[PDB]
Symmetry: C5
Subunit: 400 residues, 5 copies
């Protein structure tokens, strides 16, 4: 329209985009900075980066971009692109994006009274410290730090407004707790001018249903299946195969899991302690199986059992476990021949009885160690999962 | 030509690219926005992003870009590049691209009567929520939201035109159901001006031939092969090897499959429930194999078989399964010695008969558990695959 | 020089880069579009993208960029950068590149008679449909679609010149069959003006030496090694171990291979059918092994063999395979005692003979199934590899 | 304000951004270059690149950007964007980034006396040589080299200021030792003008907790578990299964670990020597197990054991290990028949005794080799981890 | 300075950046092109791309950028940025970078006599053909082709200068042999003007320490460990387990290695032939193990050992290997019963002797095949490693 064309022609006249738009130079310019979180697109524990889709919200009063609506009846707002009117250079301080500024420079709306608006979208990559000590039951506080890059306190009086999450779309992995902000004033070694900033802390809680179903449950099942070695009879040579192939499967699983975790050394992750406990339990099960097979394939001629181990393993554990404890010259010379055969058979029977007693001792050791291992693994897993704080509320919110 | 050069020289004179091209400022400018889907290049279930190749279509009437063809005999249309004539700043709201605007700014055609056209191509990355609950038999509704960024209802009267899929090239993985649109008016906390938008919902159905052939069928085959442990005779100490190696192979398969799935916690994926069922079946088969081997290698001196289990496992299951149930002083002193040898042989035969009865009990348990496991596996797989809606039509469209 | 400086000063005078350089506006401008393929740097079967290094070739006549060499003795050509003289906006329609235009805008040569040249290089990512039905013996026809984006038939009369492959450097994976093209005229729903285009079809044949050596040969070898179970005597407890560890190795191999193939559902890949055949063969090998072990470890007291299976497996298969078929009162009291011992030995010998006959039946079953499985594997692999068209010429060109 | 607008209008007048801002052309311009490290975001051992988030700090005196505050009462500092005032072209020489300059060009503050400030942020990818010889106990010295690209010693007198690490945020993997620098003057083959530069050496020590917990400890555990083959009795045919499955698990572990190390050939990494030692230990354990099984399954009819090995293995090793060393015509016809049976039994017993002696020799060899292997593996691991310098202080700082 | 400002103001006056800076238009402009290699940052065998960090060096005489130092006492050189003075459009022809030009356009120094310098840095991605036939002992000749894109021979007389490698930093993987260049003149189909170019061949030799320590040595070790199956006594059912687990480990290793090689079909890589030999050796070892177990578990009643195999395997191989070759009515009725028992024992002894002879034949076959396999493996590995040229000098340079 003619009025809009005239207004645009007269508005840009004698206008310097570099100049700070204030009537009095000494007075600082008030800028209201806010944020509009839309989606936590991705968080990278390994890379310690947080990818978010947010809309920055900036607003300030421009002294030069004013006009009377009476002379321009139809024109109420005007929009200027990048590089034609003054804009605050508000950057994300802790940015992990290859280009330090990830905003998409859009137009700037202008009141009929000089008030300006600026909502540049963009996907921000911020380097936030991520705790995996309580993985997967961890809550994260990733900070977004915004502030003017080259204007100080006396120039650009930055002000905070509450972050808006009305348009936030829920993420399938992270539950948002809140996004509070805090306005802080910080000095710098360059200059004697404070540089105010606005810091937004994105507190988000990880939803642990997928991790509990795909990481914790399979390890519980495989560890419990490793205890089956203590039910296999030793006569079938499959105990070591069972134990060691279970160990190999656990090795593959733990390798795949560790493929996705940060190489941080601040503390031992909860899942790392859990996997260490499972590995130790399986290894000690294999060691006990080796001991049991030593006690089972014990040659009777090797030597008599020690009295102490004999009495304890055949009395105390049996009482505890309620196990059942098993149990003319030609004529004379033929007689002595049959005597040799019969005595050989009797000696064979005695050796067989000794070996059977050794086998029973192996079985008793096996059963007692099965009970001990089952109790220990249950107690250890329960304790490890109890140790994580907010674990009960994570369970209540996800599973229940 | 001379006429075209004169027209270009005169048309740009006193033209402001910022001004909205309307004759009456109060009246809003009508913009007809459409879309031309060409190809669904990629969808990322893990990243919850949808990559599409589309041509945006905008059209509006420009009051200033008008001329009489009589004075320019050969010139019917003119073309302006980016930044020289007014263009709507129609952006994809839910964009997951590193740069928020993925369009390639092309030329802009103009009528001889002022009507304008604008078809900027580009590959758009939009963050759409992806449901894996019914994976791989899921239908996806990924939304594309377009609307002016700085112009409200009273400024840019955005309108919807039906999406064009004439040039759409079929994708090898996803079957397009449709791309309907909906024009909605939404308020914002910034301003008291409604901002109309156009939302296109891309309804896509996944073609399940590849997934059924490469994920489901191998699991059915391996789970069925795990049941072979219940046909191996216990004498060959290989049952545990069979079952455990099958479990390890399934572990590798499920790990590789889960490598491609999003870490969402809204619901348990169908294939996740299926894998859980297969893992449980294999583990229970291994447990039953351990019990069977306990029954097989039962020492006759350990104790008499309990009356209840004896009667049930030797009468009821045998009747059910129709199994066959098997079955001077020198002379006298030599006599008593040969009596000893024969009595030893008779006791050995009695112990052998008891052990054989134990072995038959183990075989009966093994056979009945084979039948139970086969029936349970078939029923569970059929039910899980039935639970997915549109499974029947997916099968009919893909396989048949 | 002075002449060149004067020519450049006078040439740009009253020159509009937007204007189409024609003397008569009504007549269209003839543009000769060609292409110079140099290297097929990459083709992504999984992503359905083709990455090529090509030089576009454009040529047209400028009415305004003309001068007389007499007044400029030294100057024969002039060069203009991007954005200073008119250039056709010829884009790759089916572009899968993040930026829709991948050309590198270079200088533009000009005749002394107005003729123009333009050879912008660039690496083009085009989305071409890729058939893996005959993989790895497949030939691919990936299309490149070029045409003016905003000029119609009456404005830019696009013409075609044959593609140049003189400078093409051979690829180590793909053998170029040819790059023919076709110039087509297509209408659009926007406008009543046809838009001519030039489509180049890149027909390339995959060289199958690497794939045959690294995928097909190892699977033949592993499948053949799986048949060794039918030579292992059943006395050594290793048959299921062999079969199932071969199955696990094939599982790893097929997983690694399937990691590289697209998730298309148009048809079952040839290598997919081949792997399915190998998996079925190994699975049935394990099943037959379980059957043979059932036959081998058959208790003699379990029951007499069925007459039909006895006669067939001990006569017909033996004849076929030419197998060798194996085979005072004290005196009376001692008499009856030794009679008992010898009768027990005779019964033991009878049971041993029955069990040995069962073992021979198992051996005969094993041998006949070995012959059947070897024949079936050879026939199936030969048929599957024969089914692929141009397989014989692929072999002749690669191996021979 | 009016004063700010007048100052900006008058300051840019007759200003040339290309000109070096010095009053006397002959005198060089002093530029103070510093650095502000904030975070070592990522280091890539495989790619030999270091990714850091740093703020360059440059400052110089501009002769033309001076004004009297008396005439501009409110204006104390002014800010210019990129391309409008002279800036030093200080580039990172050893840059491994796709674009050689990774800085984000921000504004430049200016004193009321001409002093200028410039703190452009950016994420810098520098190619630093990385030593993996002492991995994971290595300390890295990655260099950052900065200097003017086109200004020599007589033009831009580059000067140094100490690097600032007040704002440094600790990294979860690398402990910063310090960031000292050195200012060096270097000639070039192009020109006879020295080019001063500022080189900052980023000395960082790797925190070892995660690597020791996830790489070293599992290898210790698996190697120790491989020694259990020397406790399993040879009667249970599971020794080779144990050894070879442990070897396969170690193969998987070493493959996964070697996936993350560079293909560096200056020296053998410490973890590489460690894995080589573990592989040798496991392989030699398998070889010794094969020898032990040869000794155990020695047919008595094969031949008498050599006198030398007999005496040593049954006297010296027994003394060392304190092992218990185990241990009418009708009447005549029946007579000689029973004589035959008893003589057969006696010969059988003699052969059994010889085989038992062979088995005891195998057991003694097995035990002595167990002791030798345990001692050797402990000594080798201890020595390898001792060989790394600063290992003790790394352990003290991380674990303790 | 005032002199510098005046010089810059006067120099740009009547200066056209498009014009070629020559006094006489007819004579070509001489441009001296060189290169300064700094680091071979990365080479991609799979992608056939070479990533280098180089500084292009260009120099030419500008007729217009001349001044007398007498009138400008302090000004000796001036610097112009991109787009303000003429620069050769020298591009890397065989560029594989997404943007065809990877240079970073820096400033451009100028003499006081008109001579000009230009050293743009940048990381260049070039598509160079990579031979993996002799991998890992291969030497690579990757070409970099530079030349003016738009200027021909009569316009821009491109000239060569020797490449500079004084600042080259050694790479941890590739040993640089040299970077010779060659200036060639090549015609094009577009134009009748030759286009001179400068081609630099980067000859680099791969350092084989890491590859020989992580790829070759483990394969030698695993292949040698596969031969242990020929020392295991057949009585312990672990031969097939050993051989097949070794084969599975080799499968995993070869899959991981083949993950990193190009899918080229020009020729079979040396490491591929090596892996084929190892796989064949292991598979044939498994086949021979199956044959040995057939010979060992040969029932005596199947049939007499054939005369030919009997004589050869019990005489010739025994002589070769020097193996030890092992070895009233009541009375009469009781008599005949004991005769039956004794005859049964004698027949059992004869069958045992026949079985022992079969076992000895199996042992003889096993030992001879062990010797054959060891010799064949050593010979094949030595020959394959010898076949690669420059292998001896690669070993001398890396290991020694
Ligand atoms: C607060 N600003 C942003 C970081 C440092 C500081 C600053 C100070 C002076 C010039 N540039 C930047
Ligand atoms: C609808 N627009 C796009 C998102 C917010 C809104 C807006 C309003 C005012 C200034 N910028 C953006
Ligand atoms: C052929 N052109 C390229 C694709 C669509 C078509 C077109 C028509 C009108 C305006 N822009 C584009
Ligand atoms: C040598 N130049 C580079 C490749 C082709 C040739 C050329 C010729 C004319 C116009 N542009 C490029």
């Amino acid at each position: 329209g003619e009025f809009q064309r005239k207004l645009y022609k007269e508005l840009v006249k004698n206008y310097n985009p570099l100049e700070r738009p204030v009537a009095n130079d000494s007075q600082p310019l008030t800028v209201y900075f806010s944020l509009s979180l839309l989606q936590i697109m991705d968080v990278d524990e390994k890379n310690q980066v947080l990818t978010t889709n947010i809309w920055l919200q900036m607003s300030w009063t421009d002294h030069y971009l004013q006009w009377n609506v009476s002379e321009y009846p139809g024109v109420k707002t005007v929009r200027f692109p990048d590089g034609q009117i003054w804009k605050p250079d508000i950057l994300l301080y802790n940015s992990a994006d290859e280009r330090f500024d990830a905003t998409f420079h859009t137009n700037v709306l202008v009141n009929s009274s000089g008030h300006c608006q600026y909502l540049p979208p963009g996907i921000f990559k911020s380097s936030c410290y991520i705790d995996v000590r309580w993985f997967p039951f961890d809550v994260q506080h990733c900070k977004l730090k915004f502030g003017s890059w080259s204007y100080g306190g006396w120039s650009l009086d930055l002000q905070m407004q509450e972050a808006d999450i009305s348009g936030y779309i829920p993420n399938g992995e992270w539950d948002l707790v809140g996004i509070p902000g805090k306005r802080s004033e910080r000095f710098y070694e360059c200059c004697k001018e404070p540089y105010p900033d606005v810091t937004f802390t994105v507190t988000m809680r990880r939803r642990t249903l997928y991790y509990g179903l795909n990481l914790l449950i399979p390890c519980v099942l495989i560890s419990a299946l490793a205890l089956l070695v203590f039910l296999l009879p030793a006569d079938s040579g499959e105990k070591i195969s069972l134990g060691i192939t279970v160990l190999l499967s656990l090795t593959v699983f733990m390798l795949a899991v560790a493929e996705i975790m940060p190489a941080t050394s601040d503390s031992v992750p909860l899942i790392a302690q859990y996997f260490a406990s499972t590995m130790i339990i399986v290894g000690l099960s294999v060691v006990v199986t080796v001991i049991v097979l030593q006690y089972h394939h014990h040659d009777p001629d090797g030597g008599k059992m020690p009295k102490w181990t004999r009495v304890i393993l055949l009395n105390w554990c049996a009482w505890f476990l309620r196990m059942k404890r098993p149990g003319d010259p030609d004529l004379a010379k033929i007689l002595e021949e049959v005597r040799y055969i019969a005595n050989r058979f009797r000696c064979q029977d005695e050796s067989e009885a000794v070996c059977s007693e050794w086998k029973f001792a192996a079985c008793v050791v096996d059963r007692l160690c099965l009970m001990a291992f089952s109790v220990f693994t249950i107690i250890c897993t329960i304790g490890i999962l109890m140790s994580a704080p907010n674990f009960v509320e994570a369970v209540s919110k996800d599973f229940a």
